[PDB]
C-alpha cells in the first residue's frame, strides 16, 4: 500500500579511471509509481541520462534503471538522487566504487 | 427437393463432392492434421449417401451450414489450437457462419511447405495416389482459405497430370519442378485475385463487384449486347457470392451451370468460345475464364454520343443510376481491352461525380461537355508512375529496388510493424519482375492489376489488427482508388521517431552463421529501423548510415573474440549514425 | 521452462505527459515488448528488434493490448471512491510437460493482490468489494471474458513457442561475470569485504565467503540490472581489520565451467 525505495548505484563494468563505462542507478521495491530520479556528477545533474521502462516485480513493487555513459576519473564524485511520496526529502546515494 | 446435401451430391458426383467438402474443412480449420479432415469428410459423405438413398431420412432436411457447423464444433479444443474461433460454437445459425468467416486467415502466417524430395514424392504418388492428391488439396486449401474452390479442383487435375507425365523419367527433378513451380505461381495469383473478389463483395457491396464484372466481361465479349453482359454479370455475382460465403458445394454446381449456359449461347457472347466448349467439365470453366478477347465491332460511335452529346444524359441517370453507369463501363470497356479494369472504374467514378454535380446545374450539358478532360489526368498518372518505377528497377537491382520501396512505404506508414513493412515491400517490388518485361502498352494495366491485389492483402489483414490511421483511410475510402491514395501519401510527420541508445544495435555473434538471403533480410530490417529513427532522412544520409552498418557486420565477424567487437563497437555505430542523420 | 509475462499497469491520475496505462512484456528475465496509452502501439525492446519475426505479429500484440487498455481504464469507473488508484496485472503462461501451457492471471490494486482470472469458469474473481466491482464491470462487456480466455489459452502460448524457436540466440546467451573483491576500512577494529559481480547473464548467481577454506556465510547481498539486459551483483561482510587477506570469495554461475575462487 505504500513502500519506500531501495537505491543501488554501481558501474556496469569494474571501474577503471580514464576508461569508458556506464554508471547505473537502480531504484526498486517502491510503491506507488511516481518517482523522480536524477544522476549527479559532482553535485550537479547530468543531462545525457537515459532510463529504462517503468516495470514491477513478483511482489508488485515497482522498479526502474537510470543510466549514463561516463568515464570515471579519480577526482570526480557521482551520486543518485531520488524523490518519492514516501521520502521526507530527496535522498542522495553516493556511488561506492567497490560495489 | 427436400434435402440440399442430396441435391449437391447427385449433381457434383461423389469424387468432386468429397474434394469440395475436404476443401471446406481445410479452409475453416487450417491446423487440424490431415487424417482428421479425412474422417470428417468421410463422415459427411456417408451421411449424404443416406439422403441420396432416402431424402426424408433423419436430419437430411438441414441446411449445409447447420451440418458443416454441427461438425466443426466436434473439435471443441478449438480455443487452445485456433483462438477466437471457439467463441463461434457458442452461437446459432446464421450468426454462427458469419463468425467462422471472419475467423479465417487471422493467421496467414502458418509454417511454409518445404517440398519433399522429388523421388520420395514420386514414391508416395505411385503408392497411395488417391491420398497424395488429397494432401495437395488440403495443403493448398488451408493456406488460402478464400481460394476459389472449383478452380482448385482443376489445379488438382494439373498436379496429377504432372506426376503422371514425369515419374517415369530418369531425371525426375528436371521434368517436374518446372511444372510444379508454374503451377504454384498460377496458384498464388489465383488465390489473390479471388481474395479481392470476396473483399469487394463482403466489405464494399454487390454494386462494387458488379461494376467490376461489367467492365471486365465487356472487355472480353465486346460484341455481346449490354443485355447479355448483365445476365452474365448477375450469374457471376451469384457464383462468387456463394464461394465467398463458404457455400462451396452450391457454387461449384452453379458455376457448372453457368459454363453450360455460356456454351449453349455462344453466338450471343463470343466467337472465341468454340474450342473451349468441347472440353470436360473442369477444363471448360477454366478455358472460358482464361480465353482470348473477341475482336471488337466495326463502327462503334464515339463515347461522346451517349454520354455527353445526347439530350437524354440526365434523364437516364436520374431514371437508373446503376444501369446507366453500367452502360458507361460496358461501352468504355468494350472499346479498350488495353486499359485495366481498376482504371475504368475510376473513370466511371469521375463520370458519376460529374453527372451528380452537373445535373443539379442551371445548364447541365454546359457543365459536363468537357468531362473527358477529367479522364486525361486519371490515365497519365498511372502511366507516369509505372514509367518511373520501371526506370528505377533497371537502373537498380531487384534488391536495390525493394530498398527504394521499403524506404518509400516506411515513410508513409511507419506505424506499421518492421516485419510487415519488409514483406509488403518485397511484394510491391515484385511489380518490377512481373510488369517491366511487358511492352509499353501493356505495362500500366499489369502493374495496376497486380498492385491492387497486393494492397488488398494489406488491407484485409490490417482491418483485423489496425495500427495506422492512414492505412485504414486508404483502405476504406474507395476500393477503386487505393493505389493512388497510397502513392499520394507524403512523409508522416505525426510519427514520434524512435530514439537512439547504446543498445540500439545489439547483436550476439550468431549473425555470421547467416546465409546471404538471410543477411539481406536483416539489412532490410536495419533500413526500416533507421527510417523509423528519422523519417525525413534523405537518400544520402540513409546510405551513409547503412554502409556504416554493413562495415560493422563485416568487421566484427572477422575478428578473434567476436563479442568484444559487438559489445565495444555496437555503441560507436550508434554514435556514427546520429552524426550522419542530424540526431 | 521460461515464461511469457505481461506487466500491465494503469493509474487513475497520471503526472501530465505521462501515460495512463502501460505494458512491459517479458520472456524470462528479458524485456521483449513495450506499450503505452500515449503512443498506442506495441514495440519490440532491445535485441528483439532484430528477431526473425513474422508480419502481423506485432500488430496482433498491439491489437490485444488495446483491449487491455480499455478494460483497465474502465476499472476506475467501477471503483468510484476518491483515493488515487494503481491497477496492476500479471498475465502470461509457461510451458509444461506435455506440449502444455500453464497460465497466470493475477491483479493488484494499490499494490496488493486482490483479484484473479479463473480460466476454468472464464470469470474474474476476488472478494474484496473493490474486486467485486471491477470483476462485475468486466464480466458484462464485449465478451471481455472470451478475449481474456483466448489471450491466455491461445495467443500467449503460441507466442511463447514462436519466440523460443526464433529467438534461441538471445535466450541461450551466456556471459560470465567480471569479479572484484575489495577491503574497505569501516569501524573501530572492523572492515567491510565486498565481492562484486559485473555484467553477467543469466541472472542466477551465488556469492559465498570463505575464511581459510571454511564458510563465513554470506552477508548482505544486492542485485540489479545493467542497461543491456545483463546483471550486477554484490555481497558484503564485516571482518576484523588486519585479518582481511585470509578471506576469499567463491562465485557460481551458469556461464563458468566451474566455480571461481576470487582473491583479494
- What domains can you pick out in chain A, each with its CATH number? 1-99 (2.60.40.10)
Instruction: Output the CA–CA distances (angstroms, integers) from residue C31 to A53, A56, C25, C49, C229, in the order listed.
Output: 9, 12, 6, 11, 8
| Measured distance CA(B161)–CA(B163) in Å, rounded | 6
Per the document, the length of chain B is: 583
Per the document, the length of chain A is: 99
Instruction: Output the CA–CA distances (angstroms, integers) from residue B214 to B237, B325, B334, in the order listed.
Output: 11, 10, 10
Instruction: Output the CA–CA distances (angstroms, integers) from residue C122 to B75, C134, C138, C154, C162, in the order listed.
Output: 19, 15, 11, 14, 26
Q: Are the beta carbons of B339 and B354 closer than 8 angstroms? A: no
| Measured distance CA(C158)–CA(C160) in Å, rounded | 6
Pick the closest to residue B108 from B188, B216, B212, B215 (CA basis): B188
Residues of C in contact with A58 (CB under 8 A): 90
Pick the closest to residue B212 from C120, B396, B220 (CA basis): B220
Helix axes B281-290, B149-166, angle to 10 degrees: 110
Contact C9 A33 (CB under 8 A): yes
Per-residue H/E/C for B443-501:
HHHHHHHHHHHHHHHHHHHHHHCCCCHHHHHHHHHCCCCHHHHHHHCCCCCCCCCCCCC
B-interface mutation test, from C32, C38, C154, C161, most B Cβ less than 10 A away = C154
B168 phi/psi in degrees, rounded to 5: -95, 0
Contact A31 C228 (CB under 8 A): no
Per-residue H/E/C for B180-196:
HHHHHHHHHHHHHHHHH
- Grid cell of B510 as nine digits: 550468431
Subunits next to A (3 or more Cβ pairs <8 Å) are B, C
| Measured distance CA(B56)–CA(B45) in Å, rounded | 17
Contact A22 B502 (CB under 8 A): yes
| DSSP H or E segment with residue C214 | strand C214-215
| Measured distance CA(B94)–CA(A21) in Å, rounded | 66
Residues forming a β-bridge with A83: A36
- A 56-75 → C contacts, CB under 8 A: 56, 58, 60-61, 65, 67
Asked whether residue B398 is marked as a ligand-binding residue, the answer is: no
Instruction: Output the CA–CA distances (angstroms, integers) from residue A71 to A65, A76, B222, in the order listed.
Output: 19, 10, 80
Asked whether residue B434 is marked as a ligand-binding residue, the answer is: no
Residues of chain C with CATH 2.60.40.10: 173-263
When CB atoms are compared, the residue of B83, B506, B508 closest to C150 is B83
- Give the count of alpha carbons within 13 A of B481, CB side only: 14
Instruction: Output the CA–CA distances (angstroms, integers) from residue B219 to A27, B546, B578, C71, in the order listed.
Output: 72, 48, 55, 53
Pick the closest to residue C227 from A39, A41, A21 (CA basis): A21
Pairing of strands C247-252, C231-240: unpaired
Q: Quick one: closest CA in A to B502, which residue?
A: A69
- CA B497 to chain centroid: 32
Query: How buried is B281 (Cβ within 10 angstroms: 0-12 exposed, 13-18 middle, 19+ buried)?
Result: middle
Q: Are the beta carbons of B219 and B336 closer than 8 angstroms? A: yes
Q: Are the beta carbons of C202 and C254 closer than 8 angstroms? A: yes
Residues of C in contact with B522 (CB under 8 A): 50
When CB atoms are compared, the residue of B465, B503, B510 closest to C60 is B465
How many helices (H) and strands (E) in chain C? Answer: 5, 16
Residues of C in contact with A60 (CB under 8 A): 88, 108, 111-113
- Grid cell of C67 as nine digits: 483491449
Residues of B in contact with C41 (CB under 8 A): 415, 467
Q: Are the beta carbons of C170 and C30 closer than 8 angstroms? A: yes
C-alpha angle C199/C202/C207, rounded to 5°?
70
Q: Which residues contact B363 (CB under 8 A, 6 or more apart)?
A: none
| Measured distance CA(C108)–CA(C89) in Å, rounded | 6
Q: Are the beta carbons of C160 and C93 closer than 8 angstroms? A: yes
Residues of chain C with CATH 3.30.500.10: 1-172
Would you report the helix, strand and coil content of chain B in percent, each value rounded to 5? 75, 0, 25
| Measured distance CA(B68)–CA(B28) in Å, rounded | 10
Asked whether residue B338 is marked as a ligand-binding residue, the answer is: no
Q: Are the beta carbons of B488 and B534 closer than 8 angstroms? A: no
Residues of C in contact with B504 (CB under 8 A): 49
| Measured distance CA(B60)–CA(B67) in Å, rounded | 9
- CA B42 to chain centroid: 31
Chain B: closest CA distance from residue A68 (Å): 10
CATH superfamily of C173-263: Immunoglobulins (2.60.40.10)
Q: Are the beta carbons of B235 and B261 closer than 8 angstroms? A: yes
- Give the count of alpha carbons within 13 A of B105, CB side only: 19
Q: How many CB atoms sit inside 10 A of residue A3's CB?
A: 18
Contact C194 A34 (CB under 8 A): no
Q: How many CB atoms sit inside 10 A of residue B129's CB?
A: 13
Residues of C in contact with B529 (CB under 8 A): 49
Helix axes B64-72, B95-102, angle to 10 degrees: 60
- B 488-517 → A contacts, CB under 8 A: 501-502
Asked whether residue B508 is marked as a ligand-binding residue, the answer is: no
Is the omega angle on the peptide bond into residue C202 within 30 degrees of 0, that is, cis?
Answer: yes
DSSP B367-415: HHTTHHHHHHHHHHHHHHHHHHHHHHHHHS-HHHHHHHHHHHHHHH-TT
Query: How buried is B260 (Cβ within 10 angstroms: 0-12 exposed, 13-18 middle, 19+ buried)?
Result: middle
Domains of chain B and CATH, by start = 1-105 (1.10.246.10), 106-195 (1.10.246.10), 203-294 (1.10.246.10), 295-380 (1.10.246.10), 381-492 (1.10.246.10), 493-570 (1.10.246.10)
| Measured distance CA(B49)–CA(B54) in Å, rounded | 9
- Give the count of alpha carbons within 13 A of B117, CB side only: 3
When CB atoms are compared, the residue of C55, C63, C169 closest to B109 is C55
Contacts 24+ apart (CB under 8 A), B260-268: B261/B235, B262/B232, B262/B288, B265/B228, B268/B224, B268/B225, B268/B228
Query: How buried is B19 (Cβ within 10 angstroms: 0-12 exposed, 13-18 middle, 19+ buried)?
Result: buried
Asked whether residue B560 is marked as a ligand-binding residue, the answer is: no
| Measured distance CA(A82)–CA(A30) in Å, rounded | 11
Instruction: Output the CA–CA distances (angstroms, integers) from residue B506 to B548, C32, C207, in the order listed.
Output: 15, 13, 29
| Measured distance CA(C88)–CA(B564) in Å, rounded | 40
Chain B: closest CA distance from residue A33 (Å): 23
| Measured distance CA(B433)–CA(B431) in Å, rounded | 6
Asked whether residue B11 is marked as a ligand-binding residue, the answer is: yes
* Maximum Cα–Cα distance across chain A: 45
Q: Are the beta carbons of A80 and A35 closer than 8 angstroms? A: no
Chain B: closest CA distance from residue A12 (Å): 13
| Measured distance CA(B518)–CA(B535) in Å, rounded | 25
- Grid cell of A14 as nine digits: 569494474
Q: Quick one: closest CA in B to A51, which residue?
A: B501
Asked whether residue B250 is marked as a ligand-binding residue, the answer is: yes
Would you report the helix, strand and coil content of chain A in percent, each value rounded to 5? 0, 50, 50
| Measured distance CA(B203)–CA(A8) in Å, rounded | 57
Q: Are the beta carbons of B98 and B111 closer than 8 angstroms? A: no
Query: How buried is B539 (Cβ within 10 angstroms: 0-12 exposed, 13-18 middle, 19+ buried)?
Result: exposed
| Measured distance CA(C264)–CA(C257) in Å, rounded | 22
Q: Quick one: closest CA in B to A68, which residue?
A: B502
Is the omega angle on the peptide bond into residue A32 within 30 degrees of 0, that is, cis?
Answer: yes
C-alpha angle B501/B503/B505, rounded to 5°?
100
Contacts 24+ apart (CB under 8 A), B566-573: B566/B506, B566/B507, B566/B508, B566/B509, B570/B502, B570/B503, B570/B505, B570/B506, B570/B507, B571/A69, B571/B502, B571/B505, B573/B505, B573/B548, B573/B549
| Measured distance CA(C201)–CA(C172) in Å, rounded | 9
B-interface mutation test, from C42, C43, C50, most B Cβ less than 10 A away = C50
Per the document, the length of chain C is: 264
Q: Are the beta carbons of B145 and B31 closer than 8 angstroms? A: no
| Measured distance CA(B48)–CA(C246) in Å, rounded | 89
Query: How buried is B38 (Cβ within 10 angstroms: 0-12 exposed, 13-18 middle, 19+ buried)?
Result: middle
Helix axes B64-72, B34-53, angle to 10 degrees: 140
Pick the closest to residue B282 from B314, B248, B313, B255 (CA basis): B255
| Helix ranges, B200-247 (H) | 206-220, 226-244
CATH for C1-172, options being 3.30.500.10, 3.30.1330.10, 3.40.50.720, 3.20.20.70: 3.30.500.10
Residues of C at the B interface (Cβ-Cβ below 8 Å)? Answer: 39, 41, 43-44, 46-47, 49-50, 52-60, 62-63, 143, 146-147, 149-150, 153-155, 169-170, 173, 227-229
| Measured distance CA(C176)–CA(C185) in Å, rounded | 29
| DSSP H or E segment with residue B581 | none
Amino acid at each position: 500500500i505504500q513502500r519506500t525505495p531501495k537505491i543501488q548505484v554501481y558501474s556496469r563494468h569494474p571501474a577503471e579511471n580514464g576508461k569508458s563505462n556506464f554508471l547505473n542507478c537502480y531504484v526498486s521495491g517502491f510503491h506507488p509509481s511516481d518517482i523522480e530520479v536524477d544522476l549527479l556528477k559532482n553535485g550537479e545533474r547530468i543531462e545525457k541520462v537515459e532510463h529504462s521502462d517503468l516495470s514491477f516485480s513478483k511482489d508488485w513493487s515497482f522498479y526502474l534503471l537510470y543510466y549514463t555513459e561516463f568515464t570515471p576519473t579519480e577526482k570526480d564524485e557521482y551520486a543518485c538522487r531520488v524523490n518519492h511520496v514516501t521520502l521526507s526529502q530527496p535522498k542522495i546515494v553516493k556511488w561506492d566504487r567497490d560495489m | 427437393h427436400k434435402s440440399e446435401v442430396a441435391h449437391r451430391f447427385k449433381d457434383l458426383g461423389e469424387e468432386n463432392f468429397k474434394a469440395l467438402v475436404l476443401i471446406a474443412f481445410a479452409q475453416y480449420l487450417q491446423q487440424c492434421p490431415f487424417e482428421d479432415h479425412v474422417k470428417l469428410v468421410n463422415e459427411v459423405t456417408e451421411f449424404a449417401k443416406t439422403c441420396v438413398a432416402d431424402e426424408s431420412a433423419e436430419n437430411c432436411d438441414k441446411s449445409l451450414h447447420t451440418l458443416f457447423g454441427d461438425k466443426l464444433c466436434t473439435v471443441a479444443t478449438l480455443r487452445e489450437t485456433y483462438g477466437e474461433m471457439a467463441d463461434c460454437c457458442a452461437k446459432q445459425e446464421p450468426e454462427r457462419n458469419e463468425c467462422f468467416l471472419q475467423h479465417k486467415d487471422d493467421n496467414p502466417n502458418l509454417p511454409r511447405l518445404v517440398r519433399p524430395e522429388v523421388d520420395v514424392m514420386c514414391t508416395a504418388f505411385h503408392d497411395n495416389e488417391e491420398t497424395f492428391l488429397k494432401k495437395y488439396l488440403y495443403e493448398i486449401a488451408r493456406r488460402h482459405p478464400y481460394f476459389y474452390a472449383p478452380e482448385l479442383l482443376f489445379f488438382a487435375k494439373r498436379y496429377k497430370a504432372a506426376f503422371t507425365e514425369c515419374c517415369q523419367a530418369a531425371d525426375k527433378a528436371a521434368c517436374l519442378l518446372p511444372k510444379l513451380d508454374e503451377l504454384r505461381d498460377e496458384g498464388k495469383a489465383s488465390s489473390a485475385k479471388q481474395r479481392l473478389k470476396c473483399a469487394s463483395l463482403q466489405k464494399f457491396g454487390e454494386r462494387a463487384f458488379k461494376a467490376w464484372a461489367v467492365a471486365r466481361l465487356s472487355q472480353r465479349f465486346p460484341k455481346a449486347e449490354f443485355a447479355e453482359v448483365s445476365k452474365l454479370v448477375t450469374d457471376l455475382t451469384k457464383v462468387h457470392t456463394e464461394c465467398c460465403h463458404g457455400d462451396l458445394l452450391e457454387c461449384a454446381d452453379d458455376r457448372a451451370d453457368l459454363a453450360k449456359y455460356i456454351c449453349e449461347n455462344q453466338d450471343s457472347i463470343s466467337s472465341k468460345l468454340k474450342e473451349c466448349c468441347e472440353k470436360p467439365l473442369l477444363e471448360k470453366s477454366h478455358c472460358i475464364a482464361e480465353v482470348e478477347n473477341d475482336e471488337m465491332p466495326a463502327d462503334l460511335p464515339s463515347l461522346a454520343a451517349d454520354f455527353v452529346e445526347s439530350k437524354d444524359v440526365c434523364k437516364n441517370y436520374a431514371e437508373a443510376k446503376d444501369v446507366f453507369l453500367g452502360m458507361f463501363l460496358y461501352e468504355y470497356a468494350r472499346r479498350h481491352p488495353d486499359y485495366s479494369v481498376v482504371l475504368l472504374l475510376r473513370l466511371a467514378k469521375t463520370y458519376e461525380t460529374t453527372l451528380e454535380k452537373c445535373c443539379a446545374a442551371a445548364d447541365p450539358h454546359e457543365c459536363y461537355a468537357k468531362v473527358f478532360d477529367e479522364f486525361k489526368p486519371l490515365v497519365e498518372e498511372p502511366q507516369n508512375l509505372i514509367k518511373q518505377n520501371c526506370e528505377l528497377f533497371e537502373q537498380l537491382g531487384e534488391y536495390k529496388f525493394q530498398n527504394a520501396l521499403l524506404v518509400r512505404y516506411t515513410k508513409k506508414v511507419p506505424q506499421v510493424s518492421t516485419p510487415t513493412l519488409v514483406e509488403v515491400s518485397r511484394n510491391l517490388g515484385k511489380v518490377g519482375s512481373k510488369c517491366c518485361k511487358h511492352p509499353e502498352a501493356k505495362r500500366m494495366p499489369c502493374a495496376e492489376d497486380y498492385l491492387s491485389v497486393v494492397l488488398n492483402q494489406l488491407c484485409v489483414l490490417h482491418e483485423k489488427t489496425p495500427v495506422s490511421d492512414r492505412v485504414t483511410k486508404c483502405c476504406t475510402e474507395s476500393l477503386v482508388n487505393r493505389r493512388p491514395c497510397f502513392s499520394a501519401l507524403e512523409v508522416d510527420e505525426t510519427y514520434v521517431p524512435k530514439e537512439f541508445n547504446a543498445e540500439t544495435f545489439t547483436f550476439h555473434a550468431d549473425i555470421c552463421t547467416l546465409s546471404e538471403k538471410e543477411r539481406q533480410i536483416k539489412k532490410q530490417t536495419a533500413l526500416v529501423e533507421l527510417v523509423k529513427h528519422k523519417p525525413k532522412a534523405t537518400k544520402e544520409q540513409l546510405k551513409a548510415v547503412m554502409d556504416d552498418f554493413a562495415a560493422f557486420v563485416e568487421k566484427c565477424c572477422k575478428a578473434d573474440d567476436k563479442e568484444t567487437c559487438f559489445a565495444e563497437e555496437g555503441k560507436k555505430l550508434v554514435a556514427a549514425s546520429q552524426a550522419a542523420l542530424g540526431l | 521452462h521460461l515464461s511469457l509475462l505481461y506487466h500491465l499497469t494503469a493509474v487513475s491520475s497520471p503526472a501530465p505527459g505521462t501515460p495512463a496505462f502501460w505494458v512491459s512484456g517479458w520472456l524470462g528475465p528479458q524485456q521483449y515488448l513495450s506499450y503505452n496509452s500515449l503512443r498506442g502501439e506495441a514495440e519490440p525492446c532491445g535485441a528483439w528488434v532484430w528477431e526473425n519475426q513474422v508480419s502481423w505479429y506485432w500488430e496482433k500484440e498491439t491489437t490485444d493490448l488495446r483491449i487491455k487498455e480499455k478494460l483497465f481504464l474502465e476499472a476506475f469507473k467501477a471503483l468510484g471512491g476518491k483515493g488515487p488508484y494503481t491497477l496492476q496485472g500479471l498475465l502470461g503462461c509457461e510451458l509444461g510437460p506435455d506440449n502444455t501451457s500453464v497460465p497466470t492471471a493475477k491483479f493488484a490494486l494499490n499494490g496488493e493482490e486482490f483479484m484473479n482470472f479463473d480460466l476454468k469458469q472464464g470469470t474474474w474473481g476476488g472478494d474484496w468489494p473493490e474486486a467485486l466491482a471491477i470483476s462485475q464491470r468486466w464480466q458484462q462487456q464485449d465478451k471481455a471474458a472470451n478475449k481474456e480466455l483466448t489471450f491466455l489459452l491461445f495467443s500467449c502460448p503460441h507466442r511463447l513457442r514462436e519466440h523460443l524457436e526464433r529467438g534461441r540466440g538471445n535466450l541461450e546467451w551466456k556471459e560470465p561475470p567480471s569479479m572484484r573483491l575489495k577491503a574497505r576500512p569501516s569501524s573501530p577494529g572492523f572492515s567491510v569485504l565486498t565481492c562484486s559481480a559485473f555484467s553477467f547473464y543469466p541472472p542466477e548467481l551465488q556469492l559465498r565467503f570463505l575464511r581459510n577454506g571454511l564458510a563465513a556465510g554470506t552477508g548482505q547481498g544486492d542485485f540489479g540490472p545493467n542497461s543491456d539486459g545483463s546483471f550486477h551483483a554484490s555481497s558484503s561482510l564485516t571482518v576484523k581489520s588486519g585479518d582481511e587477506h585470509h578471506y576469499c570469495c567463491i562465485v557460481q554461475h551458469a556461464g563458468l565451467a566451474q566455480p571461481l575462487r576470487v582473491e583479494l
